[PDB]
């Protein structure tokens, strides 16, 4: 289970 | 408010514009491509012919090539108001930031500040470039998506939209009682931990009585409740991960039965039914997305507000004064003055002082090391607004003059004179621009610094690097007072520390030159009393009161707490 | 060196396996069911009859309901094994640190082992409990989709390994230029912020100079600087994108067109491209979730060898003493002693001075006032090793004591004194077994202490609450002193710190009535001089040299540096 999501835009 | 964060935005519209349009151009062509992909299915299942042909070149033609465009100049383009908003905020903020009196820096936190200012404007430039971006795409995606169920299937999108909440509602009832597990499991190994490093904080007062074991002791009991304790959410998280599961599986199982049914007795066709459910994912999707980042925007937006309090706070007092005069006689005087500081009103560190300054003398005052000893220094300075009293320069106050002007009038040195991570010739006039390289080099060899100056790796123009932990003490004091007479002012004023490294030659090399021939009322705050010997006039007072005054040997015509501390102090 | 992280996983064999087993079918199922999803599809375009749905649903509910079974069972068991390692790896490690001697606090921090005990135990705890979890699912799941695709069709397998390197290639060089210009960005944006950090953190002197409007000019400068690379850097994220997307566009559609060429072909059935694409698609999702876990993999791999830099750490002080008569006289002593500190051996602090105590009498000392004198303290409190001479207790040397009963005998009270979070009779009563409470009011009494303590919210049973700050550092001392008191104990270490703003007619009566008038050896040091009165044996040092001995009379005669201290007390 992952915290937070990746950064994108 | 936020109408802040509108009216910091204006200078940008044409842009935010351009992205807006270019955004629902990407979110029209990505809800438009699975209905074809679903038109180009039901030919490969049904229809085995050339219209695949059609139906796969216009899939693939307008649908991904203008998505997959319009997406990345849009994203260009919001990086490129990232930049420019984070520069014209950080601008504003620090431009604004300076310009207040002392008053609020004593009352706030200095690193408060500066992380403040650093992350902040990333948190909102963040706030105004990423989130609201895509949560504005996700929405209207979603939009979109919902629009083509009404057109599809009433009866199918009825059914999934009966169903969607029943999962959204049990998943959120479960998961708010397994993170409360969890958080509660967080607070009591927290409350371990506090325990333990209180013992371990002192801890050799602990070892003053070998407790060390019993310690160990208690802190394993806190872990075995903490044991007891985790076995429920681990249940809890059993129970959740279960139901969610076997949720998800009868609902979409339905799906499948009811849509096959559909197809079966001729009711739509079977790309119908593809294009549904695969819409039904992306949807799934875009909500999971936006549930995940509407959190994130609402800490953002609940840390921009920090900003603006301090971005238009008035400040009190306006360098309003403005006289320059071409020189002066440097004649200042005291008028029974009674400051007090503004962030604690109940005492009383000044009183009612008058006493002038004579022209060319040394003016030399030392307190009872308790009273009121370096407040002189920061009226002199304009640095605070005084209670009683009012101190005037050549019968005009400090809010007469220029403020610049004031600052080039008089310098200033403290006791831990801080320097700035750049070079010498850089430090030695931080203030004054336009400077010629041989006035610096005669103030230093009028310094006495010029020594140590030219022995360096680079000498004269040397830096102070590693953010200028290359000099000591007397060091840096020859510097600063190099930095002080460079301006080459009518009056400077002096006040050093306890330690006073320099062994006697700065103090020759005053009273050789600049304590005589430099007509200058150079007023001295002094400790250890090295200097009080030879002075011009002399004071003493605690907290605005004078006991003594006049020249030291009238001071030796009455030693009243004047000769006891100079015969206790050796 | 990781078999250490095994070498503590040991006793969880069993929960290991159970979970591995668990992990090994809920994976199983995972990599099974699409396959037959794509039976039923090619049910669906054939055999569209009751053959259908029975096999549909006898894959469905098995497969589904397996596969979240297990899921459920395994993330229970890791959780139950991530508690339990983080419950033993805390308090073993916490156990050893005690042990160690005092100068490793000495040496080292105390936030930093404070992050070693919460942060990065957690951290090692989450290796174990996560990563090796969906490290090893989404392994094995990748290595049960490889086998399915390249049993299918090996052509469009061939295709699909032909294409992946490609898209993982570009993906990762442009996103490496991109990584690379995005830091840049930052690191510029930092050294530009730091500049305006160093302005606004000592900002009396620019102030006092007035040159903040250069400052703002400066730095805009510098932003300005800044946000001309920016501009290049989102350019070429906007590359990024359009070729990542187009890229993945024209394999996918080249996958599509072949596969339905390869179905008109007719050697392929529709539920094998079915298999094909949707394994394909789950492949993706894999391939995302190891890249993402990786580097948090490393990162906590990385901040695991720091536990067992201390967890198995030799003690350099053996503890091998035993003596421990039924009672004691006290005439402690030394034998020419000389001392430095650990961190360096050249700064000494003593050298070479012995003197006696007589046993049931006051006495006093005060060395030259500069030197660290309390290092006699310390090497009474046996905190660290004697490197000349020795020093011993009534003939016996002060190690062969057993270290429990030393610490019982001799008691100490320090300057600061400190308390922990709990209430006052057990800071009292603290480092010994739940002694009666008649006895905490006796020292009550002889602390003076009775009194104040009735005027607090409870009275003897409330606690220093507020994190011990609501109390004067009076009442402080008086309550350390009472914690002496307790132990009855024979030899007493007394040393009032600078301020002693409390009533003072406790301390004459320390010195005269509260200890002085029973079995109570007690040494003494202490700034206020009025101590110097009353005293039998005052000893004075300088920089651990013994000058003078006897009483205070005796240094009348010889008041070099104690008349000299006398009227420089006054
Ligand atoms: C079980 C969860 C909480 C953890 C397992 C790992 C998860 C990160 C994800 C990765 C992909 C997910 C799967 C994506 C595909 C779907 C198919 C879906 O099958 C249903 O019949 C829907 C119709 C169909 O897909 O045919 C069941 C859930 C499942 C396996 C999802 C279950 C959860 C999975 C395995
Ligand atoms: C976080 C995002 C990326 C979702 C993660 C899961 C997806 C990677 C997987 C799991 C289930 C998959 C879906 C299972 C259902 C199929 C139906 C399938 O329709 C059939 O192929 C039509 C027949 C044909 O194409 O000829 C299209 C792909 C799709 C949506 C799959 C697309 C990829 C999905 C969503
Ligand atoms: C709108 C974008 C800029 C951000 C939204 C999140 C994206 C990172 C994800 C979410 C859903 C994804 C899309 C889901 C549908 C697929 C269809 C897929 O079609 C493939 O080419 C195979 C089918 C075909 O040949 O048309 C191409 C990628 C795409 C658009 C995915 C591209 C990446 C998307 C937009």
Redesign the interface.
Known sequence: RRYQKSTEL | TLQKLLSYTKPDVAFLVAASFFLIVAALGETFLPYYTGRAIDS??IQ?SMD?FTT?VVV?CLL??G???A???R??????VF??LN?RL??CL??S???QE?SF?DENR?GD??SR??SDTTMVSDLV??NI?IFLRNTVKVTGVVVFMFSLSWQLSLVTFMGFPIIMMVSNIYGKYYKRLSKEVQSA?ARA?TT??????????????????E??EV??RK?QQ??KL??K???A??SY??GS??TL?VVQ?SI??YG?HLV?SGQMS?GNLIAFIIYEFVLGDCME?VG??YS?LMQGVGAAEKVFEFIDRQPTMVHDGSLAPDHLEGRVDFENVTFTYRTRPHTQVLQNVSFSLSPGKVTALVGPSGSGKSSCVNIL?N?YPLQGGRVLLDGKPIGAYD??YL?RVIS?V?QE??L??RSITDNIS??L?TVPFEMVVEAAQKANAHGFIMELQDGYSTETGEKGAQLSGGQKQRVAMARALVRNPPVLILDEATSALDAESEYLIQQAIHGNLQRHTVLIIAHRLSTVERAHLIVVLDKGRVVQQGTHQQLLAQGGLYAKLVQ?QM
């Open positions: 490969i299942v085995k695949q796969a693939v991904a090539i998505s997959s465009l997406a990345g100049i994203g260009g383009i919001f990086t490129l930049a420019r520069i950080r601008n620090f431009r930031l300076v310009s002392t820096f200095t500040l500066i200012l650093t470039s990423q971006n190994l931990s333990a490093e209180e013992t371990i904080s002192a801890m050799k007062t602990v070892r003053s009585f070998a407790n060390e074991e310690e160990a802190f394993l872990l903490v044991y985790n076995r959410e681990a249940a998280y059993m991960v279960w599961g076997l599986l199982v499948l039965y096959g079966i079977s997305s995940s980042v994130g300075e640095f403020h610049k600052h200033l403290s004179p801080v700035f991570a931080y203030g621009p206790r």
